[model samples]
Target: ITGTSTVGVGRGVLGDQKNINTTYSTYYYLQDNTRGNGIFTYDAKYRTTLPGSLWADADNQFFASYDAPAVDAHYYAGVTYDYYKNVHNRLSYDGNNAAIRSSVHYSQGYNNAFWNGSQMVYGDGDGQTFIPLSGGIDVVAHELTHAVTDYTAGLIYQNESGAINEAISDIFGTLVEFYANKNPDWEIGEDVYTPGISGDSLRSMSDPAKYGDPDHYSKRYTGTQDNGGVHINSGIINKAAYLISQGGTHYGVSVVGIGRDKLGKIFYRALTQYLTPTSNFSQLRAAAVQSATDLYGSTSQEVASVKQAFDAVGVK
Candidate 1:
């Protein structure tokens, strides 16, 4: 099976606003046989051309419109879908014919984007600071990855499980961005936010410390910000993965060396096929190292580097 489901007919209207409103209002009537019921709803109020309430001012319409968000969401979704299919040979989020639904302009000035159990939701950002979170492929892939997480590890949203959840998303998110851009520079989130804000991406895979944050893991890293700062504290593992993949010095002491592609494949295989809900850093590190050894022979430099990278992060 192809493992992809098409969006229902009349799910969206292109130019006619009134027709869109009427069509979406009756979306609940169209039942999905695959889901055994109507599991999706269309919101015509989020049409592309209409001015979002948060950005009613005409001048604030610099790519903050629903058109851009929808376009970005569609494009990124396609990219992410293809990446998983072509690279990993996996079908949709659950390896089933699950339909992907997206709702753009989710809330007024909403600063975050999320993947609800059934669909993806994007926010039109506050014009002065951020734009739509869907403006970038990584952000879109990041949210979509939450669905993949729920399907795979079912990681608890706290403690190490939560951290791993965030780390895996960032890993694939960066991969999606890199795979799409086909660039080796190893930067992230460049397309989402405005260039006026220092032109910095959301996170750095190679050097998390470049953002003026710590590079290693700590128990104190847990706090009540940014969802336990899952996105921020994720830097530790993100950098570990990057450094291990692209061989480099660790804490100015130990030397590590692993081919970037080999390390990434091992990690991806472990995450998608082996790890489980209760898996923590130590467990994941061990699993990934074993996977690497199995794929590239025991005592391979790539396997050693994987273990060393996790050790550098204090995972064990």
Candidate 2:
């Protein structure tokens, strides 16, 4: 059977009316069960030489087909669930005990995965260029974070607010990946795509410049794609957060800061507590600086680095 509609559209929980049909069959479970806890089993229809099998576990049941989600989906859902719970004290995507559903192997050879208002959806990749999108922790977290952004800031998906929305996803997405691996470096979607492909990461947090794409947001960055290139331009805020967390030097400038954990807490505080939908880059810079000052004091190195990183990114 399909799952109950537990996702809220804006502020209210959308009922079963919002559910849509897809090419693949989907299913749902009781509230107490994890995504892997399954009551139904089915066969894989379109078999391929992909790395994994397709069978519906609890997490992968959201698809219309019986194909199970990849291991990455299970890994990421668990990580994101724990991240919000332990770090932010959030229970679920809605801050309530909302049931999270994910669909995998969505369309044959589909390359993109996204949050479809309620549940997270994944594609099995083109088998040549991209692997299963669920193969990475950040990819799942990135989609789940869209839900978090909707529940929290609800930043308009255009202009600066749109950029913030995308940035927040990248921020948490990278954090989830880091938290899962307990790594100091901030690289995103490192595991989602095949390494054999040339120049193929969903996005780079450590150095967007490495992408060699003008849309990747340099000090002189400019763009207008994907909601004002929110996804691409998000590198600015992503780098800032990365620098703050990892205690790294600015891209080309000479500046440094404290540990990633401290910087993470500061940004989390600013995003959840200080920011509103209309808040822009300048406001976010000010709020993050103020948060750092409040936590580490005005003259502290942490606060200085936070301010400097924002400036380095041309946020001023």
Candidate 3:
């Protein structure tokens, strides 16, 4: 992949066209050398494989259906890398300019995407539930953020800690969507999930209850399923994050909007500096408050709003 970097044009899974960074030797490779170290994307070819062959194009152009998912998988990873470096002042997911790796078209009828502790993986949906997941910027960012979580907070992936783990991804995922300003919304997986059904998503941050996710602590699931409701109970924290960015009244309590930049700083500080592996809802609240206090002062409105956002969500 270490060759002369070149530009490539591609059509994504949603038929959107964009230019990507590629490497040129004999044929073009889906490896961008302009970013951190490099961002390499792969094609899984409908099989369960770890990091399938590096994606390739004949003439530095990709418009075929098979190339579509790889296009987004590669392009979106660069955007996420930019979001972290430019906005967070961090080099990469590890803050060291690590090479970003991603794989697409993984498994037949697959309906999910994830970070397997090292690299990002995307799934081509059953066509009923989801399309190629990389089609959504939020989905791409969501999976990448898991790596961010793994390196920083290292939040245990079960019970309340896991819910916080999920929420942090959703939070930063939505932020990067706004960062790109592409069909931006507080909803996660809206573009790629249930493509047959428009105006819906896999989860919602503005209102998690819109898709049967708990928007308040009182409604959280206590069962052992889904690793102690990591995905389900994350709704509460997601709602709190939304309230922090865009003020709202929840369960009779009101929070003043603090804007996304401040929200990002507070949460980033909380995750990197304050939170521990087993931190729960109460600990998250304390971390957020301390983060806001560190960035803006204990008496500042930002600190108070962080407290109010959590209180409104019953996390206080």
Give model 2's TM-score versus the native structure: 0.75
What C-alpha lDDT, on a 0 to 100 scale, does residue 30 get in candidate 1? 19
lDDT of candidate 2 over 151-256, digit per residue (tens): 8867777767777788788888877777877442466666656657654575777786666422213443345667676666677777777677665556465458
lDDT of 3 by residue, 262-309 (tens): 999999999999999999999999999989988999899998999999
Worst 10 residues of 1 by lDDT: 13-22
Q: Could you tell me how far off, in angstroms, the CA of residue 75 lies in candidate 1 after the best superposition?
A: 1.4
Prediction 1 TM-score vs. true = 0.77
Q: Write down the lDDT of every candidate, Cα atoms only.
A: 0.63, 0.63, 0.92
Q: What's the C-alpha lDDT at position 254 in model 1?
A: 63
What's the candidate order when arranged by decreasing TM-score? 3, 1, 2
What ranges in model 3 sit over 4 Å off? none
In candidate 3, which residue pairs clash?
none
The TM-score between candidate 3 and the true structure equals 0.98
Highest lDDT: which candidate? 3
